[PDB]
Scaffold this active site. Structure first.
Site, PDB file in Angstrom:
ATOM      1  CG  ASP A 138      37.897  49.832  44.738  1.00 47.59           C
ATOM      2  OD1 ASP A 138      37.527  50.002  45.794  1.00 47.59           O
ATOM      3  OD2 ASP A 138      39.251  50.222  44.511  1.00 47.59           O
ATOM      4  NE  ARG A 142      39.722  53.915  48.846  1.00 48.30           N
ATOM      5  CZ  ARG A 142      39.169  52.763  48.402  1.00 48.30           C
ATOM      6  NH1 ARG A 142      39.311  52.425  47.131  1.00 48.30           N
ATOM      7  NH2 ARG A 142      38.250  52.301  49.314  1.00 48.30           N
ATOM      8  CG  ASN A 143      38.355  54.269  43.451  1.00 52.36           C
ATOM      9  OD1 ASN A 143      39.633  54.689  43.618  1.00 52.36           O
ATOM     10  ND2 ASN A 143      37.847  53.215  44.076  1.00 52.36           N
ATOM     11  CG  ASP A 156      41.286  52.981  40.879  1.00 50.68           C
ATOM     12  OD1 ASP A 156      41.211  51.751  40.895  1.00 50.68           O
ATOM     13  OD2 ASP A 156      42.574  53.393  41.242  1.00 50.68           O
TER      14      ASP A 156
END
Ligand SMILES: *[C@@H](F)C(=O)N1CCC[C@@H]1C(=O)Nc1cc2c(Nc3ccc(F)c(Cl)c3)ncnc2cc1OCCCN1CCOCC1
Length: 292
Positions: A138, A142-143, A156
């Site tokens: 993932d 955003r991570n 994350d």
């Protein structure tokens, strides 16, 4: 298969104190905080994640299992846990937050020097996760967390579905590999180069599999020379061994970050400037990275 010798650290709820909510999302609540250990005369800026069903505690500690096993300057590390009623995770504070909201809210100052360094750093972290045989599954803007505007780390990977970042063989057969993370790295770079745009915007996540099987991909950002876009495109090839390896993505963008203006054409990119350790920026407070 070598014995995972990671030390897991247990912290008292009274050694650290919360300060403000950083994001009361679905998972729970993340707080800015200070951690003052024992009689060490140090205050480490931290973030604290709390959520008491037993289904969750097994997950929050499996996530903590992973984030305790990594040690790299471009991957977020776990500092410790706190064994209150629900388990609390204590991580290093990344004062600037997710890169995705940093490039949106500062696009008027992001010069090609930063965009290419970020591309290097993210690749360095992902290549560490390759050495540790760890598949992020993932990767996205955003991570990625911004400690300083010239120092980002990947976070994350407690899942070690967001379709538009996923490789093709990840949508049709749920085959996840290091070489599928390259594709997500591609969409991540595309995110950075479009200063926070949403990939395949408007399209329902349903048709994304058709789109890719015909041969369509994401557009070429304006600021992107063909040298850069050629990289993003190679990440998105059908055959997975034809995609770049992360140690190559490191090398390429390293070349480009030497002459940043030759590969990214940003109008105004010369007198942009981002906040950086200069007089301001920042009582007995030390960063976690220097507390060992
Ligand atoms: C974007 F995806 C995002 O995360 N955003 C968008 C604005 C706020 C929020 C954010 O950045 N939150 C944030 C998180 C952390 C974390 N997260 C974390 C993950 C997992 C875990 F186990 C723990 Cl213990 C913690 N760790 C470290 N530091 C941060 C800092 C964060 O926000 C920074 C400050 C807000 N920021 C954005 C808004 O304007 C000011 C700066």
């Amino acid at each position: 298969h070598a014995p995972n010798q990671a030390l897991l650290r247990i912290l008292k709820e009274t050694e650290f104190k919360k300060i403000k909510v950083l994001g009361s999302g679905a998972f729970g609540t993340v707080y800015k905080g200070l951690w003052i250990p024992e009689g060490e005369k140090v205050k480490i800026p931290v973030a604290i994640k709390e959520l008491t069903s037993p289904k969750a505690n097994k997950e929050i500690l499996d996530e903590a299992y992973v984030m305790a096993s990594v040690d790299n300057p471009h991957v977020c590390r776990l500092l410790g846990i706190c064994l209150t009623s629900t388990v609390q995770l204590i991580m290093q504070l990344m004062p600037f937050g997710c890169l995705l909201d940093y490039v949106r809210e500062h696009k008027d100052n992001i010069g090609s020097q930063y965009l290419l360094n970020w591309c290097v750093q993210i690749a360095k972290g992902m290549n560490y996760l390759e050495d540790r045989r760890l598949v992020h599954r993932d990767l996205a803007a955003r991570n990625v967390l911004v400690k300083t505007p010239q120092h980002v780390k990947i976070t994350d990977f407690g899942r070690a579905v967001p379709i538009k970042w996923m490789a093709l063989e990840s949508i049709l057969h749920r085959i996840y590999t290091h070489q599928s993370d390259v594709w997500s790295y591609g969409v991540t770079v595309w995110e950075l180069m479009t200063f926070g745009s949403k990939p395949y915007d408007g399209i329902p996540a349903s048709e994304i599999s058709s789109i890719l099987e015909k041969g369509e991909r994401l557009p070429q950002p304006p600021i992107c020379t063909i040298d850069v876009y050629m990289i993003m495109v190679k990440c998105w090839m059908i055959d997975a061994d034809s995609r770049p390896k992360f140690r190559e993505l490191i090398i390429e963008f390293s070349k480009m970050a030497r002459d940043p203006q030759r590969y990214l054409v940003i109008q105004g990119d010369e007198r942009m400037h981002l906040p950086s350790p200069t007089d301001s920026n920042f009582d007995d407070v030390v960063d976690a990275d220097e507390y060992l």
